[PDB]
Amino acid sequence: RPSGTYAGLPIADYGDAPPLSTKTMFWRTSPEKLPPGAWEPAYLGSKDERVDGPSLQQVMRDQLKPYSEPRGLLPPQEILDAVCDAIENRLENTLEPQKPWTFKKACESLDKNTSSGYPYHKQKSKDWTGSAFIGDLGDQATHANNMYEMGKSMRPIYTAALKDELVKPDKIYGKIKKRLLWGSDLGTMIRAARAFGPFCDALKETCIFNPIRVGMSMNEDGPFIFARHANFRYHMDADYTRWDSTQQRAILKRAGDIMVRLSPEPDLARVVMDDLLAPSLLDVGDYKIVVEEGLPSGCCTTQLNSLAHWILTLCAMVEVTRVDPDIVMQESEFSFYGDDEVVSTNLELDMVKYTMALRRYGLLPTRADKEEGPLERRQTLQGISFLRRAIVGDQFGWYGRLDRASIDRQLLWTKGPNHQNPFETLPGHRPSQLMALLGEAAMHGEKYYRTVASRVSKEAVVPRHRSVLRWVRFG
């Protein structure tokens, strides 16, 4: 029945999480050595041969601290109110009304390759028949669904984890850092997917017309989305640091009012929503801690986080320019995917005050240069980035071009089963991935593609440069 603080946060109970994984899924594609510049998978803990560093638990503690930090301020009530209304008005106008989700659809929509979280901590497939859940997950899922249909509350229990992904060298060999993941429990996933799966489908259908850019295909949808943005005189990217842990529950509650209101079973979704926003129970292994503020990375949450982003951005804009939110929306094009943003506007936005305002809400915008100061607006869209592609304009139009280093990386590394040493190579010589690479290399001109296609060829239908450029850009 423990007590006290763990990493600045109140302890609620003993934890049930199994230990943090010390394994990576990335494998080198060749045995050849790697320059000291190259990205490698994030730190693997005590057992990590590359560097003797701190414990994984220590690394997670360092991630949890920002959630203990004092919130920034709320935007002035009247602005928050007018922004929330304007946003949800916009969505009422564009969103196609939906059928409620069944338990069957909810269960289908779940990613079967990830852990079911508390209490069973098991890969979802392991109890999946192909069309239903059985055994343990079947019970948990059947239970969660009854509570959801009854409008009864259930406390989510997230399982803390650290992201296995490629990071730049100083994250491994300098100050070691690893991204915190919140793994929802199955019951929560089922309740959230019934409540809000409709909103998500509806929202996915309008990824071109609305600023929540989730669902967008970079190749097919990119050039339209960018052309839209190019109609506006000024363009910017706030590029936030620690978005998730700086969120305010008060802002997320407004985002959640919107989702709820626009759902086909709003009384049922209300309960789920309130459950998702109540102080979060996080299992860090030793303990389950209560985290009252910030955003939980677990479950829908990508849309809730984009809504919140839209709310925040529009508040700063309304505050500085004094223009009504729906008018700001008339004179503006926004792109959001959680923390990621492009904002284009015809309005004469004061950058110093816009930045002041975002910092006042407790957000941490950052400059391109990494120097302190006001946010920078440009009169060209070229240069601004979104979803890891750089936005380029040419005689034929606007497109998203992934940078060289991202492409090089996908050559150097591949996914496989979990293992302890990232440099061990995978025996056996992935064409689906190899195709899309050649595509991305095409957008970079003559010299670069010819050195990529060379490497690709060594990994043993590889056409000419302009013959794939035209494929990936147009038909």
Ordered domains of the chain (ranges, CATH): 1-20+77-212+249-297 (no CATH), 21-76 (6.10.250.3230), 213-248+298-383 (3.30.70.270), 384-475 (1.20.960.20)
CA distance 146 to 238: 43
Looking at residue 441, its amino acid is A
CB 401 within 8 A of CB 431: no
Give resolution, Å, one decimal. 2.5
CA distance 247 to 451: 44
- 296: nearest Cα among 309, 273, 312, 277: 277
**Residue 406 tokens, joined:** 């991202």
| Helix (H) / strand (E) containing 155 | none
- 181: nearest Cα among 17, 362, 306: 17
Query: What residues form DSSP beta bridges with 133?
Result: 128
Phi, psi values for residue 31, rounded to 5°: -80, -20
- 148: nearest Cα among 197, 98, 103, 99: 103
**Residue 239 tokens, joined:** 């590029």
CA distance 426 to 117: 29
Cβ-proximal residues to 470 (8 Å cutoff; 6+ apart), any chain: none
CA distance 334 to 310: 8
Q: What is the DSSP letter of 17?
A: P
CA distance 9 to 352: 34
CB 177 within 8 A of CB 62: yes
CA distance 342 to 306: 12
Provide the pairing of β-strand 340-345 with 234-236: antiparallel
CB 160 within 8 A of CB 133: no
CA distance 458 to 334: 43
* Peptide bond connecting 198 to the previous residue in cis, omega within 30 degrees of 0: no
- Alpha helices in 119-217, H assignment, sequence order: 135-149, 170-173, 186-205
Greatest CA span in the chain, whole angstroms? Answer: 67
Residues composing the chain: 475
Cβ-proximal residues to 78 (8 Å cutoff; 6+ apart), any chain: none
**Residue 41 tokens, joined:** 């998978």
Q: How many CB atoms lie within 10 A of CB 126?
A: 14
Phi, psi values for residue 94, rounded to 5°: -105, -25
**Residue 185 tokens, joined:** 């429990």
**Residue 70 tokens, joined:** 């004092």
Cα distances (angstroms) measured from residue 375 to each of 3, 348, 358, 364, 450: 43, 14, 10, 11, 38
Residue 58 CA to its chain's centroid (Å): 24
Query: What residues form DSSP beta bridges with 337?
Result: 340
239 is annotated as contributing to ligand binding: yes
**Residue 74 tokens, joined:** 């709320």
164 is annotated as contributing to ligand binding: no
Method of determination is X-ray
Cα distances (angstroms) measured from residue 131 to each of 106, 115, 125, 134, 386: 11, 18, 11, 10, 36
Cα distances (angstroms) measured from residue 325 to each of 55, 236, 351: 47, 18, 18
| Helix (H) / strand (E) containing 244 | helix 243-246
Residue 381, helix vs strand vs coil: coil
340 is annotated as contributing to ligand binding: yes
Cβ-proximal residues to 396 (8 Å cutoff; 6+ apart), any chain: 473, 474
| Helix (H) / strand (E) containing 160 | strand 157-162
**Residue 118 tokens, joined:** 């508390």
30 is annotated as contributing to ligand binding: no
Residue 367, helix vs strand vs coil: coil
Q: How many CB atoms lie within 10 A of CB 369?
A: 8
Residue 128, helix vs strand vs coil: strand
| Helix (H) / strand (E) containing 451 | helix 446-458
- Alpha helices in 322-383, H assignment, sequence order: 325-330, 351-360
- DSSP result, 347-399: S---HHHHHHHHHHTT--B--SS--SS----BS-SBTBEETTEEEEEETTEEE
Cβ-proximal residues to 267 (8 Å cutoff; 6+ apart), any chain: 151
Looking at residue 52, its amino acid is D
Dihedral (CA of 321, 322, 323, 325) sign: positive
385 is annotated as contributing to ligand binding: yes
Q: What is the DSSP letter of 446?
A: H
Residue 453, helix vs strand vs coil: helix
CB 100 within 8 A of CB 202: no
Residue 23 CA to its chain's centroid (Å): 22
